[PDB]
Structure formats: C-alpha cells, structure tokens
Scaffold this active site. Sequence first.
Site: not given
Lengths: 180, 186, 186, 191, 184, 180, 180, 185, 179
Positions: C62, C91-92, C116, C165
């Site tokens: 997010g 991600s995060m 990513h 990704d």
Amino acid sequence: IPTVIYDIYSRLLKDRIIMLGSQIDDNVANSIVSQLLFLQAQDSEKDIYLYINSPGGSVTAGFAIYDTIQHIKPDVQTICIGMAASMGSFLLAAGAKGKRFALPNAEVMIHQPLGGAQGQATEIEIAANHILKTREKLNRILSERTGQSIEKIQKDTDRDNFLTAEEAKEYGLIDEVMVP
Amino acid sequence: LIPTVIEERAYDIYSRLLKDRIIMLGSQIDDNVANSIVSQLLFLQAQDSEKDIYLYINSPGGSVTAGFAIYDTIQHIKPDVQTICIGMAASMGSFLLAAGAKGKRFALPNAEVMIHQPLGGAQGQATEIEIAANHILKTREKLNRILSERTGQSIEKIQKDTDRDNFLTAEEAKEYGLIDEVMVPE
Amino acid sequence: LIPTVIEERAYDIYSRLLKDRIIMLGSQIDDNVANSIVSQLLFLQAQDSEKDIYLYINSPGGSVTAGFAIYDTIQHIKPDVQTICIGMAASMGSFLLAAGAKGKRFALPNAEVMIHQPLGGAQGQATEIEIAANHILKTREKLNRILSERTGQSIEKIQKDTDRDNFLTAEEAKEYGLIDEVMVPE
Amino acid sequence: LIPTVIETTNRGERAYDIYSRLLKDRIIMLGSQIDDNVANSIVSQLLFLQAQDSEKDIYLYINSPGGSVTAGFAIYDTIQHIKPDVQTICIGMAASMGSFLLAAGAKGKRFALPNAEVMIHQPLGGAQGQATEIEIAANHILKTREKLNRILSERTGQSIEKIQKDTDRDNFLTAEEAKEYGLIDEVMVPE
Amino acid sequence: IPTVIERAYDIYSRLLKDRIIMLGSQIDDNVANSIVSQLLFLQAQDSEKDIYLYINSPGGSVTAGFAIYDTIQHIKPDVQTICIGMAASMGSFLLAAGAKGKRFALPNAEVMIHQPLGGAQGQATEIEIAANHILKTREKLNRILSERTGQSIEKIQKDTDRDNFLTAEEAKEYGLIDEVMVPE
Amino acid sequence: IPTVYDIYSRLLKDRIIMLGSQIDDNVANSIVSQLLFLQAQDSEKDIYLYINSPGGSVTAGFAIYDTIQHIKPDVQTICIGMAASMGSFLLAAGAKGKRFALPNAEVMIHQPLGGAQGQATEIEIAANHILKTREKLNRILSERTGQSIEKIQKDTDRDNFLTAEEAKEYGLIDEVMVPE
Amino acid sequence: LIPTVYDIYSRLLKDRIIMLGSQIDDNVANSIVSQLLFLQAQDSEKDIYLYINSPGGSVTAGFAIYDTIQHIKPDVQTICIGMAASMGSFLLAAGAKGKRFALPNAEVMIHQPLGGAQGQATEIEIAANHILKTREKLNRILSERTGQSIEKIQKDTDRDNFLTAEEAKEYGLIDEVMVP
Amino acid sequence: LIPTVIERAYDIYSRLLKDRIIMLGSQIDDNVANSIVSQLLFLQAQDSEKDIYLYINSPGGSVTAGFAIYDTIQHIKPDVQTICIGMAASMGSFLLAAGAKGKRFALPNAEVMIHQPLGGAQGQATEIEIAANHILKTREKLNRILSERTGQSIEKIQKDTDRDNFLTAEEAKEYGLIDEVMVPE
Amino acid sequence: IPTYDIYSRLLKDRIIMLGSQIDDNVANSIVSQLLFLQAQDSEKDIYLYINSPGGSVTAGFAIYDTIQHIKPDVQTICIGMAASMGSFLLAAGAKGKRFALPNAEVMIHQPLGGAQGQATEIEIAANHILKTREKLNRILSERTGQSIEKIQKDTDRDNFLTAEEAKEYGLIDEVMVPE
Ligand SMILES: CC[C@@H](C)[C@H]1C(=O)N([C@@H](C)c2cccc3ccccc23)C[C@@H]2N(C(=O)NCCCC(F)(F)F)CCC(=O)N12
Ligand SMILES: CC[C@@H](C)[C@H]1C(=O)N([C@@H](C)c2cccc3ccccc23)C[C@@H]2N(C(=O)NCCCC(F)(F)F)CCC(=O)N12
Ligand SMILES: CC[C@@H](C)[C@H]1C(=O)N([C@@H](C)c2cccc3ccccc23)C[C@@H]2N(C(=O)NCCCC(F)(F)F)CCC(=O)N12
Ligand SMILES: CC[C@@H](C)[C@H]1C(=O)N([C@@H](C)c2cccc3ccccc23)C[C@@H]2N(C(=O)NCCCC(F)(F)F)CCC(=O)N12
Ligand SMILES: CC[C@@H](C)[C@H]1C(=O)N([C@@H](C)c2cccc3ccccc23)C[C@@H]2N(C(=O)NCCCC(F)(F)F)CCC(=O)N12
Ligand SMILES: CC[C@@H](C)[C@H]1C(=O)N([C@@H](C)c2cccc3ccccc23)C[C@@H]2N(C(=O)NCCCC(F)(F)F)CCC(=O)N12
Ligand SMILES: CC[C@@H](C)[C@H]1C(=O)N([C@@H](C)c2cccc3ccccc23)C[C@@H]2N(C(=O)NCCCC(F)(F)F)CCC(=O)N12
Ligand SMILES: CC[C@@H](C)[C@H]1C(=O)N([C@@H](C)c2cccc3ccccc23)C[C@@H]2N(C(=O)NCCCC(F)(F)F)CCC(=O)N12
Ligand SMILES: CC[C@@H](C)[C@H]1C(=O)N([C@@H](C)c2cccc3ccccc23)C[C@@H]2N(C(=O)NCCCC(F)(F)F)CCC(=O)N12
C-alpha cells in the site's frame, strides 16, 4: 464531413488515397480492406496512398490490413501524419519498401501488445501463450521490415518507446522524412 | 444477529465456541478472515499447546495466499488441528479441510466438497501477462504437490481431477483422501 | 466478526495478542493502519523497552509514506521487532518484512514474498508531471537504498529485480536476504 | 465512416457505399460478431447472389470473433442450400462460429492470408432456474456441441474424438496450422 | 430488537437461554453458521433436553440448509420444529428434519415445497457439470424427504416439480409435520 | 482499533495526540478537544502531537494551530510518514526547539487549493479570499521557519517535497531523530 | 442544424475557406488534412483561408494539421475569430508569414501542454520525458514563428496566459488585427 | 450495415420483397408485426395468386404481435410458404407451423423450440386472477391452433410444451410443425 | 431511542409495539416477545399497540397464530393507522379488548402480490394468492361478524374507516374517548 462537387474522404479515395485516421478495430479494418480491394480492381498497377494518423488498436484487425496490403498487386505507400502508435506504427512499416514516409513533426510509438486473461490457471496459460506468440509474430515481421534484429525489437518494445520522424527513419520504420 | 450466552461472563456464540477450542471458518477466505483465524490459532496454542483444536469449515474458498496463511499456521503450531466440513468446503476451503491432522479430518454426511484449479486474472502488457501466468501455474503446482502429500493421490491424478469443478460427496472425499472419516449420526 | 476472549478482563483477539507483544499487520497499508501500528509499537516500548516485539505480516502493501511511518518507528524504538511473513508480503509489505531486527526476520514455508517498483499517478501540466515523476523516482531510490542495506544486495541488483513484479518463495526470500530463516514445521 | 464509390454507366452514374460495391462483384463481408441481424443480412445477400447468377462463385470474407450458434447455422445452412460455390477467406481472425463458417466454404476454396488467426473452442451458454430447466438447457448445449463437432469432422477430415479434445479449451491456430488441420485448403502467400 | 433484564439479554438471546433457536430469515451461510453454533452450544449445555427450532423462512442456500440439517442429526438432543408463518423450500426441508413426533405447525402457517433452483454459465462441459450437480442434489433432497415423510421418491419428484403450497393440515397429511397445534 | 482503553485513548493518557488523517472539521474538533483536556489535566507538562497527514481544510488546520498557540503547555510535533500542506504547516507550528521528524518522513509544502463558480463578482470574492489565505499562511510560515515571505512564496508555487533533513535546513523542524 | 445553399461549410470550402471551429481531435485533424490536400490539388497557387475558433485539443492531431500546412504549396492564411487556445493558438501562429490575422475581440490563449500518466515509476518517467520533449518541440516552433526566444516562450506558457488580439500581434502570434 | 443493390436502388431486404420474400429475422414485437403485416398486404395487392415466402429466424416474442402476423397470413389469398433457418422458438415456431399446408420447411441444422407462453402480473389478488385467466386462455388458443396445424392432440401439445422442448428439423417434421426438411443438392 | 431502552421498558409492563411495516424480522421479534411474556406470566393480559401500514401476509399470520396459541389475552389498540395486515391483527385481539383512539385510521383491502414466468407458474401463483385471500376473509368474517361475501366486496379496493366505523364494522370493540 464536408461535401465536394462526394464526401471529402470518398473524393480522396477516387485519387487512390485511403485514410486510416482512427483507432484500429474490426470495422476500420473491414473498411480499409474493402478500399484496398476496390482500388486494386480499378487499377492493379497504380500506387495506393495510405495515410496513417492512428493510436493503434486490435492486433488481428491490424493484420487484416497488413495481409491485404501484401496480397494486392499495387504498391501501398504509407505516410505518418500526426501519430502512428502500436499497430499504427506496424502498418506504417508495412508500406512498400522505399515508399514509407512521415512528416517532420509526426510521432511514432512502438510497444508490446496489450491484453487480458481471466479464469482458471489453464485458461490464463492459454491466453499468455497466445499473446506471447502474437508478440513473436509481430516482432519477426517488424524485424523483416526494418532490418533490426528480433532481439533488438524485443528490447525496444518492452515499454512505450516514442520516436521522432527522423528516429523512425534511422530505425527503418520509414524510408524518408518529407521536409517542406 | 449473533446471539449472546451467559455462563459471570457474557460471550457472543462464536467467542463461546472459541473458549472450547472451536474455530469457525464460515465465510469466503480473504486476508481479514485469515488474520482472524491465524490469531485464534496462536491464541489457542498459547492457552494449551497439547489440546486439540477444532476447525469448522463451511466456506466457498477465496484467496490462495490467505488460505496459505491459515495452512502454514496450522502446520506450525504444536496442537493437532481437527477439521470438519459442514455444509460446503470448496476450493481453498477443501484444501484447508485436507490440511487437518492426519486421522482427524471429518465431514458430516451431506456436506459438499469441491476441488478445482486456482482462479485469477491479469491485464496489461504481454510480459506482465506472462509473469502472472507463471505465478498462477507455480501456485497450482504448489497446491497440487501439497494435496498429493495430504491425500496419497499422485500429482498427475490431482492435476486431472482439478482441471474443472469436481464436486464430491463426503464419502467420495473420504475415498479420495481429503478426509479420514464421515461422522454418521447415532 | 472478531471474537472475544476473557482472562476479569475482556479482549478482542487482536488486543489479546497485543498483550503478548504480537502486532498484526494483516491488511493493505494505508494511513489508518500505519497510525494503529505506530501506536502499538509505542505502547509496547513503554510497557517494556527490552522485550522483543513480534510483527506478523500478511499484506499486499500500500502507501509508501504509511509504510515509512511503520519502518521509522520500528528503527526508532529500543525493542527488537521480529517479523514473520505468513500468507503474503508484497510491495511495502515485503519492505517491512525486511525491516525486522537482523537475525529475526522469518517466513513460513508457503508464504509468498513479492517485490516491485512503486506505483503512482500524475495528471496536469507538463511541469506538474515532471515534479510527480521526480518525486516517485526519488522515492524509488530511497526504497532501493534501504532495501540494499537490509538485504546485502547492491542497489543495481535491487533496481533490476524490482523492474517488474518479482515473486519469491520463502526460501528464495531467505537467499535474497529479505528474511533470515524459514520456520519449517516440527 | 463508410466511403462511397461512383461508377459512370451508360444510363446515368451509380453511387455505392464500398460494401455494396463489393457485393456487386459477389463478395460478402462477414466482418463482425455473428448475431441474428448479421445472419439475416448475410442470408439475404446469399439468396440475392444466387438469384443474380446461380453458377458464379460467391466470395465470403471472414473477420469475426464468432457469436450466436443458431445465427451461424442460418448462414451455414444457406451456404449449403444454394447452388453457387461459396469460397471462404480468413483475413484477420476467425474464431468460434467464425472458424466454423470458414470451414464451411466449398471444398478446395477455403483460404486464409498468412497472418490470419483461427481459433476453435466449445460452445458457450447459460441456464438458470429449476433443476429440470437446467437439465434441459444442458442437454441442448451438449447436443449442439455434438452437431458442431460432427459437421467439423466431415469438413476437416478429423475424427469427432480429436475435434472434441482440440476444442475443450481455446485453441489458436496459425493459417498454416489451420490448413494442416483441414479447416482451410490453402494459405494465399503474397506474390 | 428489545432487551429484557433479569443480566441484560436481547430477546433472541433470552429465547436461546430456554433452548429456542429462531430460524426467521432466508437461509445463507451466515444464518447456517449461527444456527449450527447455537445447536452445538445447546448440546454442550445439556445433551438430553429438547431443543426448539422455530421456522419462518422462505428457504435459501441448499448447502447452508444441509449444514443445519446434518448438525440437527449429529447432536444428541431431539430438535423439535415448528412452522410459524411460512416454511418454503429449504425451510420446509428443515421443518421435516425435526425429531419424529415433534414436528409442528400453527394452523395458518404455509408450507411450500419445490425443486432446487440454480444457475450455470460458460462452456458446454461446465454447464454439464453444474447440471449433474444440481440433479444429484435434487435426488439427495428427495431421498431424505421420502425417508422423513413416508412418501415414495416418485411421489416427492412429482409433487416438487413446481411450487406446491400446503396448508398446515395438508403438511401433516403429507408427513412433513406430525401435528397442527390448534389453539385452546 | 485494539484495546489495552482503545490504543489512541491510552496514548492520550500519556499526552500523545495522533493527527493521522486528512484534516477536516471533525478531526480539528477532536484535536482541539484533546488539547484543552490535556491543558486542564496539567498546564505545565509537554504535549506530543504526532503528524502523519496529507493536509486538508485550511480553516480546520487553523483551529488546531490557534489552539496550540493558545494553551500553556508546549506542543512538540513529530512527522512520521508524511506531513503535506496543512500537515506540514502544523508540523512547523510546534514549540520552538521541539519540532521533529523521523529520517524517512516526507514533508511537502505547496500553495492552497480551492474552487469557485458563479458570477464574475463571486469568482473575484473567492479569488481574493484564497489569495489572502495564502498571504496569512506564508506570513506565519516565514515567522516559524525564519525564511522570507518572498522565498516561501517561490518555494510553494508548486508541490515541493522535502526530506526530513531538508525540512530541518528549511526551518520547518528543529531536529531529525536518528535511530540509536 | 446546418443550412443548405451545398451545406454551408462545403460552400465555403468551394471558395478555399476551411473552418476549424471545434476541439482538435484526430477526426477534426483528418478532415482538415483532407481539405488541405483537396484544395492544393484544385489549385496549388491560390491561397487557402483557415478560420480558427478552437479551445485546442490533441497535440499530435494539431501537428497533423501543422505539418500538412507546411507541406503543401499554397499559402495558408489564418484568422482567429472568437478564441484560439492552446493548440488552436499554435495553429494560428502557423499560418503563412504576413497572413495571420485576428478580429479585434478575439481571445488568444497560450499555455503548456497537459497530460497524464499512471503506473510504475519507470512508466511515469517515460510519460514525463515524452511530455517534456513535446513541450520543447512546441516552444521551439513557436519561437521560430513569433520571433520570441525559447526562454521567454517557456516563461510565458508556464500558466494560462490570455492575450487580446492586439497583444497577440505584439507577441508575434499574428501579423495584423483586422479593424472593421 | 444493410447493403444496397442496383437494378432502381434497393436495400437488400426491399430487393427480396420485390421477389415476394419476407424476412422475419428478429424478436417479434408490435413494430416487427406491423412491418410484416404491411408486407403481406402489399404482396397480396401486387399479386393475389403467387406464393409468398416467409423466412423465420426468430426467438419469438409477443403473442398478440404473433397473432397479428398469423391472422394476416390466414386472411390473405396467396399461400405463405414458411422456412426455418437458424431458429424458430416460441411464437416463431407457431408462425412456422402457420404456413400453407405442404409448404412449411426447415433447413437441416435449424432449431425449432416449443414451450408455453410467458408473462407477468403484479398488483391486487383480483388483478393477478384476471392476468392468470388471460394467459391460460391464450395458451388454450395457441394449443388448439397448433393441434389443428400439426395433427397432434391438444393433450399431447399441452404435455410437450410444459417446458422448453427443442426439436431438430427432422423432429419438427415428424411432429407436424413442418412438412419437409430441404436437404442440400 | 431514549434510555432499558424505552421499548424494552414498555415490554417489562407487557406492552408490545407493532409500529412499522410487517416483515419477517418484525414478526419474529413480536412472536418472541409474546412467548417471553407468556413465560413470565401466563394469566396477565398483554397489550399490543398497532401503528402499521401492513406488509407480508405470512409474517402477519406468524403473529396472528402466536396470539391465538398463547394463554394470555392479547388486547389490541390502533393508534395512528392500522392498514391491511395491520388491521387484520387489530381484529385478532381478544374479544372485547380491541380498541382504537378516536382519530386512528383503519384501512382494509385485498392482498397484493406478483407472479412472472410460464403460464402454469402464473396459474399456481394466482391460485395461491386467491386461497390466501379466502383464508384472510374467512378469519375476518369470524372476528367481525360480517359475512365472507361482504368482506370480499368491502376489500375489493382500499376502504378507509374511522375508529367509529371500525367499531360498527366489528374490527374493534370500543373507541377510547379521552377523559
Ligand atoms: C483478384 C484476384 C484476388 C485478389 C482474389 C482474392 O484473393 N480475393 C480475396 C481478397 C477475397 C476477398 C473476399 C472473400 C474471398 C473469399 C475467398 C477467396 C478470396 C477472397 C477476392 C478477389 N476478387 C475480387 O477482388 N474481385 C473484384 C472485386 C472488386 C471490388 F473490390 F469489388 F471492387 C474476387 C475474385 C478473386 O479471385 N479475388
Ligand atoms: C462432543 C462430541 C462431538 C459433538 C464432537 C464434534 O463432532 N464436534 C463437531 C460438531 C465439530 C465442530 C467444529 C469443528 C470440528 C472439527 C473437527 C471435528 C469436529 C468438529 C465438536 C465437538 N466439541 C464440542 O462440542 N465441545 C464443546 C462445545 C461447547 C460449546 F459449544 F462451545 F459451548 C469439541 C469436542 C468434540 O469431540 N466434539
Ligand atoms: C511459541 C513459539 C512460536 C509459535 C513463535 C512464533 O512462531 N510466533 C509466530 C506465530 C509469530 C506470530 C506473529 C508475529 C511473529 C513475528 C516474528 C516471528 C514470529 C511471529 C509467535 C510466538 N509467540 C507467541 O505465540 N506468544 C504467545 C502469544 C499468546 C497469545 F496468542 F497472545 F495469546 C511469541 C513467542 C514466540 O517465540 N512465538
Ligand atoms: C520514550 C522516549 C521517546 C521514544 C520519545 C519519542 O521520541 N516519542 C515519539 C515516538 C513521538 C510520538 C508521538 C508524538 C511525538 C511528538 C514529538 C516528539 C516525539 C513524538 C514519544 C515518546 N513518549 C512516549 O512514548 N511516552 C510513553 C507513552 C506510552 C504509551 F504509548 F502511551 F503507552 C512521550 C515521551 C517521549 O519523550 N517520547
Ligand atoms: C482554561 C482557561 C482558558 C483556556 C479559557 C478558554 O480560552 N477557553 C476556550 C478554549 C473556549 C473553549 C470552548 C468554548 C469557549 C467559549 C468562550 C470562550 C472560550 C472558550 C475555555 C476554557 N475553559 C476550560 O478549559 N475549562 C476546563 C475544561 C477541561 C476539560 F477540557 F473539560 F477537561 C472554560 C474556562 C475558561 O475560561 N477557558
Ligand atoms: C502531389 C504530390 C504530393 C503532395 C504527394 C504527397 O505528399 N501526398 C501526401 C499528402 C500523402 C497523403 C496521403 C497518403 C500518403 C501516403 C504516402 C505518401 C504520401 C501521402 C499525397 C499526394 N497525392 C495527391 O494529393 N493526389 C491528389 C489528390 C487530390 C484530392 F485530394 F484527392 F483531391 C497522391 C500523389 C502524391 O504524390 N502526393
Ligand atoms: C430459388 C429456389 C430456392 C432457393 C427456393 C428457396 O428454397 N427459397 C428459400 C431460401 C426461402 C427463403 C425465404 C423464405 C422461404 C420460405 C419458404 C420456403 C423457402 C424460403 C427462396 C427461393 N426464392 C427465390 O430465391 N426467389 C428469387 C429471389 C431473388 C432475390 F433474392 F430476391 F433477389 C423464392 C422461390 C423459391 O422457390 N426459392
Ligand atoms: C382487397 C380485400 C381485402 C384484403 C380488404 C382488407 O381486408 N383489408 C384489410 C387487410 C385492412 C387493412 C388495413 C386496414 C383496414 C381497415 C378496415 C378494414 C380492413 C383493413 C384492406 C384491403 N385494401 C387493400 O389491400 N388495398 C390495396 C393496398 C395495397 C398495398 F398494400 F398498399 F400495396 C383496401 C381494400 C380492401 O377492401 N381490403
Ligand atoms: C406452553 C408451552 C408452549 C407455548 C410450547 C410451544 O408451543 N412453543 C412454541 C411457541 C415453539 C416455539 C419455537 C419453536 C418450537 C419448536 C417446536 C415446538 C414448539 C415451538 C415453545 C414453548 N416454549 C417456551 O415458550 N418456553 C419458555 C420460553 C420463554 C422465553 F421465551 F424464552 F422467554 C418451549 C417449551 C414449550 O413446550 N413451548
């Protein structure tokens, strides 16, 4: 659309000019294919002039046009005015060798095909294989038309790649920039 | 909607069941549901690392990664996690049913078990579609390998039997090796 | 939806876990989630500045700035924050997984880690687009630099590996340096 | 959108849209999704062309993602019913009922251009309501699939069992693969 | 929903204290999970005392209905059933699932039986799988209804072909319930 | 929101106020109330204002700003995550020497945003109002940072992102708290 | 809607007047390009008259028109009636030197190009580079046509800049204001 | 969408109408019925003795619209031949069966579907009763006419239309809905 | 809802409020309250307040049958409006203990419904709603003393009655005039 004493596009068609001036979908392809067949029947030896100002669109529709160009006897000259992106730039490169042009401020963009797949794993696999084969087919033809290797085409189309008219000439997508 | 029971303590019915080591997986499996079930499993292990846990499954499935959060937590903790299918266990639900402690996977007689291949989506560039396809294919291999280990069926048979929606009765799920026993009523 | 446990005191399940120094990051990371996690970290440090904290991560990622709120708070406080990936860290989420105390970053065997480049948007005038582009590029450099320090990989390798990704198994995440250990079940 | 062409004849000039001009030379364009309207138009064109000349070949251009099975069968049966041979060509794409119609052209006169895409798959449909209504709909779509596969077998020379297997999921063929399969007779290579 | 004070209970929780479970809505997974939980709680509180299942329901999910059905048969206590208002479709199936001799309706209650409903879209083979599944589900329902009512499977099949509305007295004659409770 | 008190109320017991969302009237009313409560509990002990906010309503921001300046206790500010627009204005409003950020926090400053429709004279009134609002913001920012009004005007013309260290150099905060 | 005499626009085209009276998109560009080609073929020496009342629109569509104007042999006179904004004002400035006009109450507006980008950081970078290059191309051509420096054009197009007809003349966008 | 032919300039459907071919190629609603009724009246006036050819590719539709067409067919002097190409369902199959005896056809892969009429009613009990009585009378009318045209009993028609009943062209012939399947030469 | 919440406070004194459209939720709640009150005291009267536009017939019958099933007398009062199933329930109160306030409105009409699908499905739905109307009219006849034929005629369309007209009709026993 103004009238001349014909609507303007029909008047241009009388002089063997076909306008590809929109997104490429099946309707546009069917119309352009029909115009090419009509023009070949009118005169199988005289050049045809294909104007391209298009953001691209359907790959299969683009191939309808591509294959019809190669099938007919007349040379099809291509010119990029405004923009030729994606399948538009593919069709620009499909014109008769030596007769692919752009005006100086025209924009050419090349990139990989776009698509989608949803459903079961095996359905996603089938869709992925299909779009990858489609990309190989496009890249192979682009290689033949530009003189660039398939490996270079692959690398250069990985993301949106904008070319000036002069860069499109250096790339082999067109043969000449028409300077005023 | 959710009734309260009073034993002095007031519990909603699900919390009352949790006090007796019963966890309810009664919905679509998403991250929220997985987080809640993972938390309940960790709480129960801390309360008693030796006593069995009872996982009720009435679920149409859902997110694979959320399902794996639950799966890995089951395997990680010390207590045996018994599983029961009541109503339906489909997709990741049936995968979790099969994940219960060996000998302690059950269904009631009219429960429905459904197995099929994972579902997903991808849009964008050819290379993005390829990445998504490779990922879902690897995920399917991972699921099938674990299902093979848990059922005793070969990977090739699992692949064939999950190609399309495959509905099993509780008895067929037992014969398949997804569960150990059908609890017939006394 | 969230069950209650009674010990004199009545706790929802997540609050019960927080009493044992377990924080659940089980959703998309936005400002609300970050504020809650930051608050929990500050509370736990005040309760005991020496005892380890346990951060569970099952998250698709997010907001980058929200993620950095959590990241900086982890580094600021005295207690070691252990991290575990259960389900997915993308991600995060995977950035925060890598942010745990050195030697105390874990994943369960079927957990999925995805890395990513950051995503964003910009519309308006050319100069506004330029400002937004420069900002997201600087943000990516900041993320990659920190990831390099946490993993031991070069910034150049992180850049290459996050271009699209990139899905890793738990074992691959360990080899990459995002985690220290895969907890295999006993 | 659709250009006009003007031909000056001895009793006043004629104005045609491009598709009508092609129809004058016995070319019919199936260039869209196949629904009842498209089928009615194509059926009408076939009947008109047979009445104009019962011996001269008709040319059916196919660039279509497919569509309604019953609409496709309206076209199929009309092709077989009329006296003229109907040549078929795939330009762009022939998928589903489109590829079925491609295969329905006169034997020896089914073509594709080299980069045309042919796709075959099983029919799609829907059913809702009571168990017995679902059963009726299922039986109907299964019989429809058997009918399609039987005709495809006759037109390609492939066995019904092979057609069944090859249409279980989306199966994309190149023009050359469509020829090898028996869906078309020839790939027209450019001169 | 009113509260009653002895401790504070909402009215439904107060009824649950006296072993009354209210199935008063469409049957979906949430409703089934709640009813299953109440049945398990009540058995644990007292494995010998009867449970009372009130049914005013238009039916709903077949698998959710079977969650309730199987839990009723699994537990030790007898589950008495009563139809008040309406029991349609899976609601009427659950009404018939109560302990033998302890299935009731009030005189103006409506019972409706019919075949299961569903849907399917996609490829021919997917439609076939869905059709086979719903047909097997219907056979399962009819077989159980035959056992619970004493009617033959052939008669159940015929009588559920379309919507079939029964009065409480007709439901008794059919074998769906044992008694109509007439007011004193 | 977990219980220990809900977590935010527990922090408030230790004089920590969380401004962790977009600033609207509800958020301002809550923060104003917390500030008044804390001053009444102890008029001498510091208050700690956490800021992770994209900004929001200017008047709501000024409700918070004026309440901070009005009360007796020092209000320390910390940026964790992001302080943008009115968020960064409130960060700069903390007690001198007690404005902080964590090292990876983002601070953004820009001019106020708004809208107006209707008659020319209504547009003029709205324009004058937003221009006066900008002057008010810039003047206060100048006083809090030590930068000139002319520099603030120039630096807020478009979105201007600062690192925590750059925010310190600018005078928006006093210190970056580096981890021990 | 459109009266007959020929529809009115076709009647004007017979006298070599082309109306650019809408937002510039690909359809409008294709039509105007076709009219320019038709008029050159009718008479390669007689002037063409391009009426401009347009809020602007697509840059590539505008360049289709621009390049076609420069490519053909006839001089293309331009007049601004009503408004020429953005690409509209660019096309106004593209008319034959000495033959660019406006009526006295016509409005000319110049500003930088607008666009968008979403997705990954590298995709945003590509889109940003593209729109910045597009702006450089526009500014360079505007510099050549107006006599203003590139640096001045950059500064004056940073935000919406409205000019009167007389100010457009002083700027070099047009050559003359036609007074009644 | 609809091509033109020049002999006079005709759209393709008008050209077919000149040769006494009427196309019923859509859902049957009032507009479609009005158009077909008009074509039938025009053709009878052009020539009261020559056959008319009615092409049917239709999923059915409005019963009253279908009866407008049905009654006009029976009213006019010319024989109306019917052919099913693609599909004739519901009122479409009723109209297929309404063609002149001996001159009702289908192509081999055409689909014929028969079922009971569909409808709707909401409001007061007495309004629902009126709507129910009306649709039941309409079904009796349809079944009686179908019985006369096929040679099947009313009881058999009732049973066979209780649910969707799909017939092949050959089965439609056996049933008496058509007289002949036109096999290709 | 002011604070027991006010409705629960009234329930403690054996007052049940039917103050909304009658659907399954409302019926379930009222049925539960009736069962609770009978268990608290099987001899003391219950007071059912009715201000309702009506609603589901089967839900209304859940309430009706529960009223008749339990031992305590259920007094009914119309305050505001009792329409459709609301007026049916008003008439269902213990004989002699059905009331209205003077300006209360009572409305009677036939049941409403719907049916779509095949002819035979429409027939089944029509037969069902007609049987339901016969059941309602028969019970209303027994409770009012009016003939079934008169009830049929008077419910053909919306028929609004004053409290006094409802008394004359036999839907209630008494209008409570203010003291
Ligand atoms: C003149 C040889 C090649 C070009 C040959 C051909 O390859 N096609 C292709 C393009 C074709 C188009 C549409 C349907 C087809 C069906 C089968 C085979 C080819 C088809 C059609 C083409 N034909 C014509 O183009 N006739 C003149 C029509 C002129 C006008 F466009 F109508 F104005 C039909 C006679 C034929 O043998 N061909
Ligand atoms: C007492 C024998 C049967 C009733 C047995 C059983 O079959 N189940 C079933 C219904 C069951 C429910 C949920 C998850 C399960 C997982 C695996 C196996 C059975 C499960 C659970 C049940 N259990 C309880 O009912 N415990 C007390 C529950 C108290 C309260 F409901 F919380 F109040 C766990 C001990 C057990 O052996 N059973
Ligand atoms: C008892 C050994 C394993 C089970 C170990 C472990 O693997 N985890 C996992 C499940 C875990 C959960 C959440 C965050 C984590 C972060 C890093 C590592 C593991 C984490 C946390 C677990 N811990 C507890 O479960 N403590 C008691 C909490 C009780 C209650 F749930 F709150 F009720 C922390 C002490 C620990 O070493 N572990
Ligand atoms: C214990 C030293 C460092 C950690 C110091 C600090 O850096 N912060 C930070 C994290 C902080 C948080 C929120 C707002 C702030 C505003 C200005 C400066 C720091 C702030 C606040 C922190 N404080 C506390 O955390 N107090 C205990 C509260 C415990 C509980 F969470 F309520 F349970 C306030 C006293 C203080 O000096 N600090
Ligand atoms: C304590 C002196 C200044 C700070 C003074 C003041 O300026 N205000 C302001 C902030 C104020 C707030 C709300 C309404 C007001 C209306 C008129 C004037 C000031 C108002 C109210 C403030 N008051 C209080 O703060 N009372 C205690 C409340 C404690 C708790 F927050 F409830 F916990 C009322 C007595 C008063 O003179 N003031
Ligand atoms: C007369 C030399 C230059 C002007 C030359 C040219 O550059 N183009 C350009 C504008 C052009 C337009 C469309 C498609 C093209 C494709 C390839 C190359 C140029 C193209 C087409 C142009 N042509 C005409 O303009 N023909 C007359 C058409 C008159 C009317 F518009 F139809 F009324 C085709 C013969 C040609 O060599 N040219
Ligand atoms: C020419 C022999 C077969 C082909 C025969 C036939 O089978 N049909 C079919 C296709 C047909 C079409 C539409 C409605 C029909 C109704 C009943 C039977 C056949 C029908 C119509 C066909 N007819 C014509 O095609 N007439 C000329 C029309 C030319 C033009 F299309 F209008 F241009 C009517 C005379 C006839 O006996 N037939
Ligand atoms: C020639 C006996 C019958 C066929 C008779 C008849 O029954 N109708 C019917 C079909 C009719 C149609 C429309 C409106 C009517 C109104 C009242 C009575 C009959 C009407 C009209 C029909 N008429 C015509 O058909 N005239 C020619 C029109 C030809 C064309 F369609 F325009 F091409 C008017 C003279 C008349 O007596 N009839
Ligand atoms: C004098 C007995 C009649 C009233 C009897 C009865 O008819 N029912 C009915 C209303 C009933 C309700 C719900 C489910 C049922 C299932 C089967 C049979 C009757 C049921 C339930 C009723 N019961 C109670 O009402 N018990 C007290 C409940 C008090 C409180 F509501 F919880 F506050 C259960 C014991 C019983 O035998 N009956």
